Design an enzyme around this catalytic site. Sequence first.
Site, PDB file in Angstrom:
ATOM      1  N   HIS A   1      48.983  42.438 -63.348  1.00  0.00           N
ATOM      2  CA  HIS A   1      49.266  42.016 -61.970  1.00  0.00           C
ATOM      3  C   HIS A   1      47.973  41.794 -61.205  1.00  0.00           C
ATOM      4  CE1 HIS A   1      50.526  42.246 -57.690  1.00  0.00           C
ATOM      5  NE2 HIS A   1      49.584  43.175 -57.591  1.00  0.00           N
TER       6      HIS A   1
ATOM      7  N   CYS B   1      53.190  37.006 -59.187  1.00  0.00           N
ATOM      8  CA  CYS B   1      52.001  37.309 -58.405  1.00  0.00           C
ATOM      9  C   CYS B   1      50.748  36.651 -58.947  1.00  0.00           C
ATOM     10  CB  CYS B   1      51.802  38.815 -58.318  1.00  0.00           C
ATOM     11  SG  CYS B   1      52.783  39.448 -56.993  1.00  0.00           S
TER      12      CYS B   1
HETATM   13 HG   LIG Z   1      52.806  39.799 -61.515  1.00  0.00          HG
END
Ligand SMILES: [Hg+2]
Length: 144
Positions: free
Chosen positions: A34, A104
Amino acid sequence: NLYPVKLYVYDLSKGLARRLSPIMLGKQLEGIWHTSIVVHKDEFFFGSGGISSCPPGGTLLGPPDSVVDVGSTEVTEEIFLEYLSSLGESLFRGEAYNLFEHNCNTFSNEVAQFLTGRKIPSYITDLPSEVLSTPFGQALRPLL
Ligand SMILES: [Hg+2]
Ligand SMILES: [Hg+2]
């Protein structure tokens, strides 16, 4: 005026992917990546709630695993917030969040490109496809 742009990088698996990926997935992954963009003193990220910001390292995830230098930008805080507003009304409404296809890292990549003209590394953006190319990914896909 030039402003530094950073990519905050987090392993959602806290090192588990590195250890367990060969048995789970049949392939070596180093992390479940992430990312978020840190610029003008705030950390910006995407999610099912839409675009959000916290103080850098002040999301629920805590401090990043790596802080990567993207480059410098001429874009001021006021123009960047107008830009993010545009994104959030169009391609980054919370409804468009998809863990594999529009996540993201999709956000961070397109923001990096706008601000500095650079993309983020493919080993982050290609992760969802690596996972999906496996019996595991294909079996857990609909759960999603
Ligand atoms: Hg992500
Ligand atoms: Hg926060």
